[PDB]
Write a protein that binds this ligand. Structure first.
Ligand SMILES: O=C[C@H](O)[C@H](O)[C@H](O)COP(=O)(O)O
Ligand SMILES: C[As](C)(=O)[O-]
Ligand SMILES: C[As](C)(=O)[O-]
Ligand SMILES: C[As](C)(=O)[O-]
Ligand SMILES: C[As](C)(=O)[O-]
Lengths: 248, 248, 246, 247, 246
């Protein structure tokens, strides 16, 4: 349901949210930005009222009540996020018990499958945040997709052992083999900075990309956001991507 | 399914009839106890023709074709057995593809759950074979059942992490929590020698016991087999068990 | 290429060779401390006894043993790890020969190196003489799992995959293109029962090698026959069950 | 690049590019801690319009799309460069899929052969960058060329094992043995600072040299660039090199 | 000795004559601790043939060597198969009239033996195994190291010498000649005609063969086959024919 090919953008207020929507973002991620927690509900409501596209926000890993709060606020997606300060080092939220869908992070297929078994409706394949360095996203998108291709083509009777080795639930691997891909959407995130970066993640088999606040620190945010959106959609149109790269 | 019962190893029709007469719920046809393989089909047919109770026979771990052969012979259960020389060190038979039910070995809940995910219809909790030493059976029945009790009572949102730690498929753990026990029958095996041994395994939560060829090396096999059968059925009748122990 | 589905049998003389041929073997392997190439006399005896292809073994790296067998008119040379290796580091440059070679392998890296040296056929095999099929199974599972990975992997990842496997990338590229090895790959190592032979086919072997154990049985021709039929009809479990009785 | 004996120069603008061309460079490399990426296309176009010699630019290792962008801009060579921040730690670009030729870095023959198997059209043998220390270039040119000489003269039947040990594709080694050298041009790079440095790399068997922005931080860039060009071309003319070193 | 030749171990005059008759280019006279042979046995062999006679001495045993020199032996073999007399220092062979053959396992050893005054080399691993791998490993190593030196940049030789433990002047000489400045024969497990021809294929100048020859049913035929195989080492039809008897 999350528009494959799409871009999700971090926004801290209504103004930024409108710009993101206008640029063609498929959704926005409402943020406030020591200990980093769920954002003030006021800020989230401000963003929810400002746009018609889906609004995400987010919670600390394992913070069941932060998630219930966001659910009660009417948020469209909850992001159980590793960039916030984890509330639980061992157990993620049991997302199956919620009405609102969750996006979760993953670095390999084992993690992806465990997040899915917990009830994740969407994945974000991501390494380290805030670096501006795409290598984080690339490493993990390459890993996850390589592991998927292996599972898709492997002998059926080898899956249980593969699941053991990956730390994955076998039924998720069986579903992956059946579909030829993950049963949920998987967006890239981590250092996606240029239009070429965004298109690269699509080339590597991402379903879409997350982009951070860097967009709004540029001289012309609406042009920059726009370039990312178009590059992500038209990820094989290298003449366009070249042209879009000139402004920055 | 066949709870409270005793399954006996037999090498011929004579032994098989004795086992049936003693009250065994099934027999396990063997050639002997170098490389140990599936038994000659002739020996298995001899045992099948000699009795009306279910007949089991052993295949090497991972030996898909040995299993198909036994299936074609009309065997009632296939035992994918660790006492035979493994054919595959990494991958067990995909038992879901078979008509005939399988029994598999396990030493802990992770193994049990993996065998179930491969399609096992019954479990045999067992350590080392041929020792006459019950400690093998006890160690593993205690481990499996302790791990089950933990899962049954644990917080629902901790299961995915528990599954990862055990190397188990989470859907099997979820099923275990739902039923309050394993979704298949779990018999003890390994060194069950005396009537007290058999009753002990039932005390520890086994659904039944396997016993080996030791029975037929005694002076009075039919009496000995009988004593095991009665002790396993009446596992809390200590006066009876005491009386049954006097002979041999 | 060899009749995929086939059985290749070890024979020490003309009598055994004829039995193997009669049982339906696709080829025979002529055989005779340090284990060397067999006396040419024994190989010629086997060559004259049958019309099916005749193979014979040389020590790993023993270029001249191979040239000798080539001169004798052998149909295939088996550069064999069960003989005492003559060279621990370098296999024969089989590209320089007219006669085709079969080589052993335990994983895809080895397979690809043997192919780059000019191997025309592979034998996926672990330890010999054990009667234990686990040797064959371990390596056939490994080689085929690695092939499936290569066939489906992203094209731009192959150079790195080759580095990691110790394989020549052009062989991996060829594998990806064909969806399989560019040569026939038979299982060997402890193939003892008809069920064993059929199992190897189930695991994706193109055929099987079987050793002298056949001729130590009470009825070699019946035994050889059972292996041949099981290998050909590897999914006919009723037949395999029947064949296992004797 | 095509012309062996040549010098390739880093330039950040049209002015520098013209100077490089005037000094006799065979090509220019257009350039713009923190993250180092492909340069703004505007800067690359500025350099392309300023000169008639080939223009190189760039991309991060593994950054397939940055490379496609430069291809679309009409760049003459793409440099998949280790001095930029790698985008992919494991997989380099599949350069066979491109129209424009690539130069890649290498530190030994195994790397060189892997880059060639990925479709590299040119090599840059280089250690650490930005030091002004020629030891980086020397170590690796000595290693690569020593390994080549070994392969060229070694017994044919030992190449498969040699390839395994190097981590090289055997067909590239076979090609090397057949030609008596690498099938692509191999330039030195890394700390080439003086005319003597440039001539040394040629003495050690380089096909040419890359030089960095240091040239344009000198008092007389055109004279300095010129001295490097002449020293690289006339690498055994020690009287000339001595004279060129005075300024 | 003469290139392409075979040197044979003999324990008496009878064996020595057979070796000479078979076409050996020289013979090696032989007789817990293994020492120089009784001079009587060596004289018996010297009187029995016209081809050169060698014998082997213990390593470092300067006086054993002087004794053999005084007996009129044609070559002294400072041999690792005898019990070493000196673990650290080989004989200073430059002080002798009679030429020495020495063993080596790699180019460093070869070059050190040459610097001590060796006139001939024997590239050899372990003795008495019947396993050619010993000879092959070391002939491949020595010749690979030579090819490297022959083609390497002149200014890199001093460092190469340091790394090999070799005298640089010997490496310089090797580079100049394109080969070792002395003859280098293979030894160690050379058993069949194919073995002998293989060593020549690998770049040996000749081969040593042990007493195994005289434990065969027909020593003169066997010795003969080795001689012809070593001389005609690329004539595979001949080598194949020569292998039949044995
Ligand atoms: O930075 C977020 C990481 O993925 C965490 O270490 C996460 O808690 C690990 O996932 P799992 O608990 O499934 O290993
Ligand atoms: C450790 As297992 C092969 O029994 O799942
Ligand atoms: C090429 As190999 C059998 O030495 O790994
Ligand atoms: C294949 As590489 C030189 O990045 O190790
Ligand atoms: C055999 As030595 C003493 O030269 O190392």
């Amino acid at each position: 349901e999350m528009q494959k090919g799409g871009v999700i953008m971090d926004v801290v207020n209504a103004e930024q949210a409108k710009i993101a929507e206008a640029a063609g973002a498929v959704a926005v991620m409402a943020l406030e930005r020591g200990v980093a927690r769920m954002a003030d509900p006021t800020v989230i409501e401000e963003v929810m009222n400002a746009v018609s596209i889906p609004v995400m926000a987010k919670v600390r890993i394992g913070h069941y009540v932060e998630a219930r709060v966001l659910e009660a606020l009417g948020v469209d997606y909850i992001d159980e996020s590793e960039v916030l300060t984890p509330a639980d080092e061992e157990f993620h939220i049991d997302k199956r018990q919620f009405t609102v869908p969750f996006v979760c992070g993953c670095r390999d297929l084992g993690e992806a499958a465990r997040r899915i078994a917990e009830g994740a409706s969407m994945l974000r394949t991501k390494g380290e945040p805030g670096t501006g360095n795409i290598v984080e996203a690339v490493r993990h998108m390459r890993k996850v997709n390589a592991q998927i291709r292996k599972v898709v083509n492997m002998s059926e009777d080898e899956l249980v052992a593969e699941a053991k080795q990956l730390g994955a639930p076998v039924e998720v691997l069986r579903e992956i083999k059946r579909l030829g891909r993950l049963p949920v959407v998987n967006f890239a995130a981590g250092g996606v900075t240029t239009p070429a970066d965004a298109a690269l993640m699509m080339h590597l088999g991402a379903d879409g990309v997350f982009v951070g606040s860097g967009i709004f620190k540029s001289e012309n945010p609406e042009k920059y956001a726009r370039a990312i959106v178009e590059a992500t959609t038209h990820y094989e149109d290298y003449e366009l991507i070249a042209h879009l790269s000139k402004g920055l």
